[PDB]
């Protein structure tokens, strides 16, 4: 379905938390943001420990529940929510005006935000969001 975005961000080879922090800041300023190519988004560090943290979040829960997303679609969306006061009116409106996508459903190419890009030629210790999702058990639909 259509979503009229003011800003379209390209998450490809970009440090997740840094994109997320900027997308949150913009959503609270009234912008309708759309994060694109989230499967190709990046997160630094040793893969074994990163996956361990995300696997623990999946195993955590009870009857009240702890719904933790396995797909890179929802993982990026949850990362943004943690940077937004989603329980408050202004915060929920900001969050609901942000959507994360697998690939690029638009004709326009996304913009790469400043300070978010990771130089692959300078880094080897990082993981792609899709690689985390495959290890978590999600169905590769990208």
């Amino acid at each position: 379905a259509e979503f009229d975005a003011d800003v379209i961000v390209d998450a490809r080879d970009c440090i997740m938390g840094r994109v997320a922090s900027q997308v949150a800041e913009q959503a609270l300023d009234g912008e309708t943001v759309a994060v694109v190519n989230a499967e190709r988004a990046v997160i630094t560090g040793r893969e074994e420990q990163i996956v361990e943290k995300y696997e623990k979040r999946v195993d955590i829960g009870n009857d009240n529940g702890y719904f933790y997303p396995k797909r890179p679609d929802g993982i990026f969306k949850r990362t943004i929510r943690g940077m937004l006061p989603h329980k408050k009116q202004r915060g929920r409106e900001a969050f609901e005006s942000v959507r994360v996508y697998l690939g690029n459903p638009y004709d326009e190419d996304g913009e790469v935000l400043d300070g978010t890009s990771l130089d692959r030629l300078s880094n080897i210790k990082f993981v792609t969001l899709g690689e985390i999702s495959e290890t978590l058990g999600a169905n590769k639909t990208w």
Binding site: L121, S122, N123, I124
Partner: protein, 172 residues
């Protein structure tokens, strides 16, 4: 640092991104050489491995990249050969190459055949009691050779009395 490797006349090598393809008369080997701030490029007749950093970790990998490229040069010309001998004490071991995998039958009296798959374009030739693992990619040949020795691994009983198996005789 910067280390220049002169390409042999028999060999001609192309490169795209982080992958280096090395072609010759014995075959073609493509390898991915990726490490922080180490640029591997082809400067006409030489392969250049350079970096702006000179730390212990960077130096470790520059030297590893050198040996990998020099090995690819040797692989596409002279090739890589590992020689193996099959030893048996009581039970006659039947080693055969059935398809793209080398099968070992009647090992130590087993009814079920032990088998391992051959890695890449590696060729395993058998002449009775002698086996010769050969090919251009040292990674593929070294493993296929090792896989054959590892296939007859025995953990349950004493290896000193039960010495049956195919062992590596010649290392290149």
């Amino acid at each position: 640092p910067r280390v220049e490797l002169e390409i042999p006349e028999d060999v001609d090598a192309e490169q795209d991104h982080l992958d280096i393809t090395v072609e010759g008369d014995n075959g073609s080997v493509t390898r991915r050489l990726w490490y922080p701030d180490i640029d591997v490029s082809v400067d006409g007749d030489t392969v250049v491995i350079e970096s702006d950093e000179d730390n212990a970790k960077t130096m470790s990998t520059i030297g590893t990249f050198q040996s990998h490229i020099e090995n690819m040069f040797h692989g596409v010309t002279e090739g890589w050969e590992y020689g193996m001998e099959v030893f048996y004490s009581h039970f006659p071991m039947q080693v055969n190459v059935e398809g793209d995998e080398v099968v070992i039958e009647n090992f130590l009296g087993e009814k079920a055949p032990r088998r391992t798959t051959i890695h890449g374009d590696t060729d395993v030739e058998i002449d009775g009691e002698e086996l010769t693992v050969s090919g251009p990619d040292i990674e593929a040949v070294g493993q296929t050779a090792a896989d054959i020795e590892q296939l007859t691994r025995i953990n349950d009983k004493d290896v000193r009395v039960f010495q049956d198996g195919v062992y590596i005789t010649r290392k290149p």
